Amino acid sequence: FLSNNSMVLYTDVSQWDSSQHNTQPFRKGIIMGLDMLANMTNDARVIQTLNLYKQTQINLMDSYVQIPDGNVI
Amino acid sequence: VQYEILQKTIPTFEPKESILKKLEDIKPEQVKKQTKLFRIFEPRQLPVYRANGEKELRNRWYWKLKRDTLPDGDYDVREYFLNLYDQVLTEMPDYLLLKDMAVENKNSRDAGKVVDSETAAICDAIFQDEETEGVVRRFIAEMRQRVQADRNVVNYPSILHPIDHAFNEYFLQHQLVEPLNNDIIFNYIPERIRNDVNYILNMDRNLPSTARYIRPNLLQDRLNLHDNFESLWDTITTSNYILARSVVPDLKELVSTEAQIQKMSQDLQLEALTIQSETQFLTGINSQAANDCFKTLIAAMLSQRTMSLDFVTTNYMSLISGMWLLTVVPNDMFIRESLVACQLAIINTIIYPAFGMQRMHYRNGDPQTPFQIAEQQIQNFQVANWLHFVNNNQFRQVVIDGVLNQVLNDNIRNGHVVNQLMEALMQLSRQQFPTMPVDYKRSIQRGILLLSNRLGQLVDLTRLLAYNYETLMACITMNMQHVQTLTTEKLQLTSVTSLCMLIGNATVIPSPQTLFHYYNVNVNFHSNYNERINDAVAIITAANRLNLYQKKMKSIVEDFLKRLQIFDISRVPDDQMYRLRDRLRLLPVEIRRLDIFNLILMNMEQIERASDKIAQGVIIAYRDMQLERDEMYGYVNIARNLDGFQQINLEELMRTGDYAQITNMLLNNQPVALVGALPFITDSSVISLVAKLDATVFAQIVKLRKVDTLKPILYKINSDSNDFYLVANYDWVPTSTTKVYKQIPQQFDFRASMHMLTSNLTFTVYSDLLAFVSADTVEPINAVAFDNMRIMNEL
Amino acid sequence: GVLNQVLNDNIRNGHVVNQLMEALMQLSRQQFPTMPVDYKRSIQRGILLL
Amino acid sequence: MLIGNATVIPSPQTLFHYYNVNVNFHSNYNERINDAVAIITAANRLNLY
């Protein structure tokens, strides 16, 4: 669809890891989806699995990072 | 080991998250048993002042309000009474036993009981006062509880204001419990399950008539949410659909997949050196999908959720089973483009190539689906009658047992449609394909033989689906409407083929526990639905009968959706709430709420005449009028009729600020009244009377226009006022400008305020009503359908 | 002494929109005979929005 | 699709601003017209060509 009437916006998004849109909202959207999906099944193994994936996202919402520098950490 | 610590100020992003449930996890309700009797008034000792204003050696009991908390401004007063109505409904009991709350009178002759703790407190207080007549002591000594146990009835004494009697008596005479016997336990179950001999019922208990039970309000959908609330309807539909999937049985012994598929292979005569479209017939013939299709169909047809198809045209068996499907399942139950594509495939690769015709020349938006237009081009009785039946297969909307039902033809249920299907398919097998080669004939005819060698199992399957469908339909309370949903469920025809090729001589019947669980869940949902409607309808119809104009009828609707623990309230918009409101306005109120609100309407003003923080108006007559004698105050500046002087309403002035009128009337000293809720202060002095302060308060209104900082003065004068020697010696009746519009408390008559509250004695209350019934099924091979003929019998 | 461009007095009150919505409800209730099906239901519901 | 239940009208301050501005514009317009007309007419009556 390249033509005299169209344009295209292209963008490098590799630096967008510490950004404010990959923290809280991103995780919480997924949490919400899991809540809906938990109400979209009747078996218990599946709800447990979904709850474990959810709990993984809970733990990933607050995450610290070991980094040495010489001797201290 | 070593550690060094850093942190980082994260944000705090908090969506609403709309905490959900599912239907089996909806807790039903918890009944309200009554606490204390909801008093609004109580007695209270006050001093009393004889005429001439001075004081007795005696006191007197007057009625006063509990919890004087009332606001400033009439709008906020109407808010107060609306909140009060909400509070009463939060305290409106369902049943109540008086003996739990009763206590003992410390001064009764016969050592009897009364109803409440404050009743006995008041009795003891009035007994221990020095300055009460002997007649109330005689009365207090005679007042006791009477019982007649032949009738299971008690009558207890009470002491309470007449409005209080109105409220409590209404609770008594309209508490919704009914006598309980096993016949109602029976008749609570649907007819169709009792009339079905594949379920047997018993119990190991005999409840007495002294027991009780609450009957749910299974009144139907007043709102018609199938009519133009398609998002909510889709939610409800999916949310009932999933519950229905929870209750469809898992299948019994199926034929061995590897053995059956070896048989298919033998009957197909594959080749290891060709592509052979027949090969695609084997796509997805596992278990767990046959069961899934069996589940999807039944839950869809009970929930009235539409469903769409996905199928790769390289697999012809998908089409060959979709034939059977479209016969035995109606067509408006599917979304249009799906079965359009399916019928188009079926036409353009089994039928028109068999009778030697063109492919088709089909329009996208043709008002006829391809089977309808194709019904007339061909000339063969079997296929044409088959297509006629298929095209004219549709539900029957019939009202049974109060609920509407989407019933099948009664020619699909008794499996006979399969004979039409097989006649059409046999008369296609016998044809040649003048246009198409013989290998292609061989492929197609071979495919339909793989399904034709399972005839009896398919007849039984159709009967089984019909049986389970009707049997599960019976455990529904909300009527089941046929209106297409936003969203479908993708059904794969590979799963259908899995079903059609793996089944035999093992019958699945819903267990009675699944049935009763499903029934109680639909009951709880429906009763919650109606009761919450009744809440919101009550408040709305109240609010339109009170001129509550600043109020925005949104949070109520939000509460209505919140108490229904399945919706996403943070992402239902506002217009939809208002449409729900627009329908809710037009509904009748239930009897409880309507009667209580009528009581509150007729007596809210009387409740408001009390509450000595705010007065109901103020007169200003530029003339030295006289003060009125009363005997809980002394000399007061009080008015209680307000005839004569003309009155300005203040909410009209607060709404539309136009102070020219009030200003002109004040400058030129024109007499007036000012109506509206207003605080005051009680100036108990005398030197602040002759100085005439209570006219000074209004000159700020022209200076500062906000009429909210407006506080009249109340000139109560008596022998407890520090300056009463003036009126005694100088012999002057007090006189004052600017009277106040107010009523006095009502004197406490212990005799006439005593009443007898009547109630039952010692019933029991049961909730989980189908817990006393135990239920079981006949052997699944030895089942039987509506036609009195064994299902899952054909071999 | 100023010229002015005024409206039709069924707009100063919102009353003409009632007739608009009557037409729009009718259009929702109507088919689109030549038209396809996925594109049609979407339009009907998009009208029912307004 | 995004509106409801919040009435916003012009503040009297905004109205007075927009009225004073239109007044100022119109008066400036007519006064500068008068100046131009007078200067033109004087250039054509005093034979300034």
Tab-separated table of C-alpha atoms in Angstrom, chain A residues 18 20 23-26 28-29 31-33 35-43 47 61-62 64 66-67 69 71-73, chain B residues 2-8 10-15 17-22 24-25 238 242-243 245-247 568 570-571:
chain	number	residue	atom	x	y	z
A	18	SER	CA	12.638	0.315	31.625
A	20	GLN	CA	6.563	3.212	32.343
A	23	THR	CA	5.563	-1.955	34.213
A	24	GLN	CA	2.155	-1.959	36.160
A	25	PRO	CA	-0.439	-1.486	33.345
A	26	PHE	CA	1.034	-4.250	31.202
A	28	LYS	CA	-2.370	-5.760	35.334
A	29	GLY	CA	-4.024	-6.117	31.912
A	31	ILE	CA	-4.006	-10.228	35.366
A	32	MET	CA	-7.458	-9.017	34.277
A	33	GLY	CA	-7.426	-11.332	31.271
A	35	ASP	CA	-9.484	-13.362	35.808
A	36	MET	CA	-11.865	-13.478	32.797
A	37	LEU	CA	-10.295	-16.705	31.560
A	38	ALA	CA	-10.576	-18.241	35.020
A	39	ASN	CA	-14.300	-17.521	34.812
A	40	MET	CA	-14.192	-19.021	31.245
A	41	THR	CA	-13.462	-22.614	32.427
A	42	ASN	CA	-14.979	-25.159	34.824
A	43	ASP	CA	-12.059	-27.497	35.569
A	47	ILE	CA	-7.837	-22.611	37.102
A	61	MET	CA	5.513	-6.765	39.236
A	62	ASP	CA	8.131	-6.194	41.991
A	64	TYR	CA	15.053	-6.705	42.218
A	66	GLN	CA	21.671	-8.575	41.586
A	67	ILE	CA	24.470	-6.599	39.913
A	69	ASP	CA	30.605	-3.982	40.773
A	71	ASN	CA	33.471	-6.642	45.216
A	72	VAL	CA	30.218	-5.063	46.483
A	73	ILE	CA	26.738	-5.956	45.194
B	2	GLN	CA	27.901	-8.561	50.310
B	3	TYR	CA	24.888	-6.343	49.684
B	4	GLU	CA	24.206	-2.748	48.744
B	5	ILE	CA	20.703	-1.448	48.367
B	6	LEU	CA	18.952	0.936	46.000
B	7	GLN	CA	15.294	1.670	45.364
B	8	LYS	CA	13.241	3.445	42.732
B	10	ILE	CA	7.618	3.374	41.122
B	11	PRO	CA	4.187	4.838	40.266
B	12	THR	CA	0.956	3.401	41.647
B	13	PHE	CA	-1.434	2.581	38.781
B	14	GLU	CA	-4.708	1.171	40.148
B	15	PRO	CA	-7.450	0.074	37.754
B	17	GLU	CA	-10.373	-4.670	38.313
B	18	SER	CA	-14.159	-5.398	38.691
B	19	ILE	CA	-14.019	-8.489	40.948
B	20	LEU	CA	-16.034	-11.289	39.380
B	21	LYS	CA	-17.517	-14.684	40.158
B	22	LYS	CA	-19.246	-17.467	38.250
B	24	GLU	CA	-21.886	-21.930	40.787
B	25	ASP	CA	-19.864	-19.650	43.108
B	238	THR	CA	-21.859	-16.764	27.999
B	242	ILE	CA	-20.312	-22.018	30.790
B	243	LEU	CA	-22.408	-23.295	33.692
B	245	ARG	CA	-20.954	-26.872	29.985
B	246	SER	CA	-20.163	-27.790	33.597
B	247	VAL	CA	-23.187	-30.129	33.798
B	568	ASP	CA	-17.492	-5.490	34.454
B	570	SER	CA	-15.765	-0.248	35.285
B	571	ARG	CA	-16.331	-0.872	31.522
